[PDB]
Ligand binder design. Structure first.
Ligand SMILES: [Mg+2]
Ligand SMILES: [Mg+2]
Ligand SMILES: [Mg+2]
Ligand SMILES: [Mg+2]
Ligand SMILES: [Mg+2]
Ligand SMILES: [Mg+2]
Ligand SMILES: [Mg+2]
Ligand SMILES: [Mg+2]
Ligand SMILES: [Mg+2]
Ligand SMILES: [Mg+2]
Ligand SMILES: [Mg+2]
Ligand SMILES: [Mg+2]
Ligand SMILES: [Mg+2]
Ligand SMILES: [Mg+2]
Ligand SMILES: [Mg+2]
Ligand SMILES: [Mg+2]
Ligand SMILES: [Mg+2]
Ligand SMILES: [Mg+2]
Ligand SMILES: [Mg+2]
Ligand SMILES: [Mg+2]
Ligand SMILES: [Mg+2]
Ligand SMILES: [Mg+2]
Ligand SMILES: [Mg+2]
Ligand SMILES: [Mg+2]
Ligand SMILES: [Zn+2]
Lengths: 23, 154, 60, 118, 127, 97, 83
RNA sequence: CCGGGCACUCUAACGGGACUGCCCGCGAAAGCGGGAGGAAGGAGGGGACGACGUCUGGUCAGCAUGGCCCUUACGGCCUGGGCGACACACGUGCUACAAUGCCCACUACAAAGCGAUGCCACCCGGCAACGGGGAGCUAAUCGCAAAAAGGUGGGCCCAGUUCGGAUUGGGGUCUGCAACCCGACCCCAUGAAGCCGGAAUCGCUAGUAAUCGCGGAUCAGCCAUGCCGCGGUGAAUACG
């Protein structure tokens, strides 16, 4: 869900980028 | 409301059959504003209805709603030191509302993995004589019949 | 500890992170707006007196 | 004892089954499949013995796993506890170590509620 | 040659041009079934073209911007109805009783201080 | 040559823009009309009371209105005449090219 | 933590103390307030009195406590228990 | 992108438009019911706006101010700590307990805002946070900026699971003189409770509830899941 930093949804919720939510 | 009577909302007839009953059923299926998903669930159910019991899906749907509709219902009311289930009639608008709500709830109680098959199976179950919704309607009408002594307490 | 705090905030600190904003009117350290340099209370007071140019009550 | 002394479940894909090993996550369950030439889409029950032996050898040679990893973690916690570190002190009392609040919450560490007379 | 309509709905604005043609309809340079792909209500925009029998007699060029796909669909419907009533005054009948030529002024309500939303109030508890 | 004029109050800004447009036609240079740019609105929200009453708020806004004027031809006779005009103090101007 | 492009931080007033000790009779009792200062391998063997905000706690440095900070070895809150 | 045009959308100033204004009925009248026309119909929808007074209501810690009290200290400076404690109790929230779902790839559609010790395009290096070059923009010009739910395709197949993401170990980035007490973020590993919640209790009548994302103030950085706003999708019911 939104509480997991290792997913697209979780990175979107935290407003950050990384391997799972690239820019 | 205290002042006046609530004005009923006129739904828009659905863009496949021009039937407002279909629109109301979709609105009962929908949650969280996901209207497209609800419409697709209903149309997949219609396709499955087309496969098994190959009559008109609209006919099966209307027959299910007619079978689930209740004519009597009990309302609670405290008089003196006791609460009474007063049996009362149901207006046709509330008949439709109850039928749709019960159909959707009973369909969601079924254990089938996908929702589109749950709705279709419940619809063709209520079409003939069976289903959870028909059982609920029978329970409600039996409760209203078993309280005919208090019909004066309304 | 009010006057000394105001003057100390008006002074240059050894480190750049020790500088903080205060209200130029009443000396408040909380809720100080950068655009005006004033705290919310002083901002409301001055805006109600027409002494803030272009500033008006908002309603939409 | 199939891989690293553990039995990865059948009827599941190899990448999903690999994560059942202590020390192996989804990222490593993809790395161990992109370095042994084995399709992640296949089930564990359908694997050539060469694939199984090569995967086992590569996994047990690449990453510290299972009991050895547990020993490493426990040794690190003992090192923190012995030297009198602040994290060691909070490890002694079973309290949150990463600076969380303890007036409320902190139930994963402290366990069930122990209501007293107020 | 052309016939123009303007349709506004819920932050969405649609410009509709009608020409004589086989019936080809194009929204923002793409196709109708491609722009509103997988949207069941997308046929509703061409309701005014069905009450008046010129469903396959008008080529329509539509540019939409703002709002969302459903708001754009209703903006398209309003613009098409306005263009059709501009084609001749006699098209007002069969469109007015169905309300195809009235603006729907239902906008999102502004958030107010003290509420989580426009009307959703914080959870209350005495004591 | 492009003249951008901004102001807090729209009435005096509009009067200045109309004055510029009217005066620019004394020696006509194909004057381009005063066009309005999107008003920029800054909002501030404050607690009404000095202490503890969070649920009561007051909204204030400060708006910047912007207008643009263009002259196609230079019109030096009309350009040097634009040096000493009637400019309200609330209107801030900027000439450029 | 601190970035490795930057060096490990020492206040340079306690580093001078241990460095001056290392060539001038290298064992004594130093009192310091730099709880943020990182322990260095040169500091091993010294007993440093680190402020906890109320008192100087003597800490004897060893090898397995080199990368930490001094403040982690002077607890600042006294708890015991409830009751 | 250009020439060109202001048709259209839009931008922002000025105006019109809706007033029971008309027709039928009811009634002394005020008015009530129905209809036509109109974008809009009976206060069109939402704000700003809070009477005489009440509560010995709140604020001497925003400010101001009567009296009382301190005057090498109840004043002032610095370092470090505390406001972040923790057998427990309560309020307000966030994330879930799954298939009307979760994950992965591609592909659409907004509004209102902010930006010169600033916003940062693009290119290069690292899985990444980010770093190194380096345009454009004092900004309807350039940037933040990716909208997300959605649509298409595939994977998972009823499990404490490809549900859920707490806790902990390790490796790092950035801000800051300085992240131990006590920051945020990235990556690897760990993968807790939780199977829809007792007595009870809360919000909401329509573009509302529900659900999805976006911006701003404070601000070096941020413990924001808060607050103030913005738009997308969009119900059910009101007998009484
Ligand atoms: Mg009411
Ligand atoms: Mg003091
Ligand atoms: Mg600061
Ligand atoms: Mg400040
Ligand atoms: Mg594992
Ligand atoms: Mg909203
Ligand atoms: Mg014009
Ligand atoms: Mg009192
Ligand atoms: Mg008090
Ligand atoms: Mg005072
Ligand atoms: Mg006083
Ligand atoms: Mg506090
Ligand atoms: Mg704490
Ligand atoms: Mg509360
Ligand atoms: Mg709660
Ligand atoms: Mg949360
Ligand atoms: Mg899992
Ligand atoms: Mg998960
Ligand atoms: Mg810290
Ligand atoms: Mg359990
Ligand atoms: Mg389960
Ligand atoms: Mg309660
Ligand atoms: Mg109401
Ligand atoms: Mg919260
Ligand atoms: Zn002030």
């Amino acid at each position: 869900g939104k509480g997991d930093r290792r997913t697209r949804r979780g990175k979107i919720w935290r407003g950050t980028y990384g391997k799972y939510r690239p820019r | 409301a205290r002042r006046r009577r609530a004005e009923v909302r006129q739904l828009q007839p659905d863009l496949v059959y021009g039937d407002v009953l279909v629109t109301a059923f979709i609105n009962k299926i929908m949650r969280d504003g996901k209207k497209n998903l609800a419409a697709r669930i209903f149309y997949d159910a219609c396709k499955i209805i087309q496969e098994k019991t190959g009559q008109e899906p609209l006919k099966v749907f209307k027959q299910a709603v007619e079978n689930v509709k209740p004519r009597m219902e009990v309302r609670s009311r405290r008089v003196g030191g006791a609460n009474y289930q007063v049996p009362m009639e149901v207006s046709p608008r509330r008949q439709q509302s109850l039928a749709l709500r019960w159909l959707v709830q009973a369909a969601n109680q079924r254990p089938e993995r996908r929702a589109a098959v749950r709705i279709a199976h419940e619809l063709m179950d209520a079409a003939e004589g069976k289903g959870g919704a028909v059982k609920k309607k029978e329970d409600v009408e039996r409760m209203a019949e078993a309280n005919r002594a208090y019909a004066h307490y309304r | 500890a009010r006057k000394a705090l105001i003057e100390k905030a008006k002074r240059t600190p050894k480190f750049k992170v020790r500088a903080y904003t205060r209200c130029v009117r009443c000396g408040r350290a909380r809720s100080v707006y950068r655009f005006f340099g004033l705290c919310r209370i002083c901002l409301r007071e001055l805006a109600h007196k027409g002494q803030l140019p272009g500033v008006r009550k908002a309603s939409w | 004892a199939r891989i690293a002394g553990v039995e990865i479940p059948r009827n599941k894909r190899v990448d999903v089954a690999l994560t059942y090993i202590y020390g192996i996550g989804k990222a490593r369950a993809k790395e161990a499949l992109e370095k042994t030439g084995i399709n992640p889409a296949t089930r564990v029950k359908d694997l050539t013995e060469a694939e199984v032996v090569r995967l086992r050898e590569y996994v047990e040679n690449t990453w510290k796993l299972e009991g050895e990893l547990r020993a490493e973690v426990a040794a690190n916690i003992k090192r923190l506890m012995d030297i009198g570190c602040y994290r060691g002190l909070r490890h002694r009392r079973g309290l949150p170590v990463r600076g969380q609040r303890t007036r409320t919450n902190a139930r994963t560490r402290k366990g069930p509620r122990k209501t007293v007379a107020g | 040659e052309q016939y123009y309509g303007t349709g506004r709905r819920k932050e969405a604005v649609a410009r509709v041009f009608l020409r004589p043609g086989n019936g080809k309809v194009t929204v923002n340079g793409q196709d109708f079934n491609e722009y509103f792909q997988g949207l069941v209500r997308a046929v509703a925009a061409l309701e005014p073209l069905r009450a008046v029998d010129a469903l396959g007699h008008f080529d329509a060029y539509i540019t939409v911007r703002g709002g969302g796909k459903s708001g754009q669909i209703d903006a398209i419907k309003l613009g098409i109805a306005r263009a059709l009533v501009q084609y001749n005054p006699d098209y007002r009948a069969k469109l007015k009783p169905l309300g195809f030529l009235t603006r729907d002024a239902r906008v999102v309500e502004r958030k107010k201080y003290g509420k989580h939303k426009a009307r959703r109030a914080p959870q209350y508890s005495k004591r | 040559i492009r003249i951008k004029l901004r102001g807090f109050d729209h009435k005096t800004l509009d009067a200045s823009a109309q004055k510029i447009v009217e005066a620019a036609r004394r020696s006509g240079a194909q004057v381009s009309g005063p066009i309005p740019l999107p008003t920029r609105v800054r909002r501030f929200t404050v607690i009404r009371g000095p202490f503890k009453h969070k649920d009561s708020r007051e909204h204030f806004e400060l708006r910047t209105h912007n207008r643009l004027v263009d002259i196609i031809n230079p019109n030096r006779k009309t350009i040097e005449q634009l040096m000493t005009l009637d400019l309200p103090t609330g209107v801030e101007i900027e000439i450029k090219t | 933590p601190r970035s490795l492009k930057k060096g490990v931080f020492v206040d340079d007033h306690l580093l001078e103390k241990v460095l001056e000790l290392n060539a001038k009779g290298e064992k004594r009792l130093i009192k310091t307030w730099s709880r943020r200062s990182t322990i260095v391998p040169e500091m091993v063997g010294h007993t440093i009195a680190v402020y906890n905000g109320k008192q100087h706690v003597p800490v004897y440095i060893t090898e397995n406590m080199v990368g930490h900070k001094l403040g982690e070895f002077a607890p600042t809150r006294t708890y015991r228990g409830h009751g």
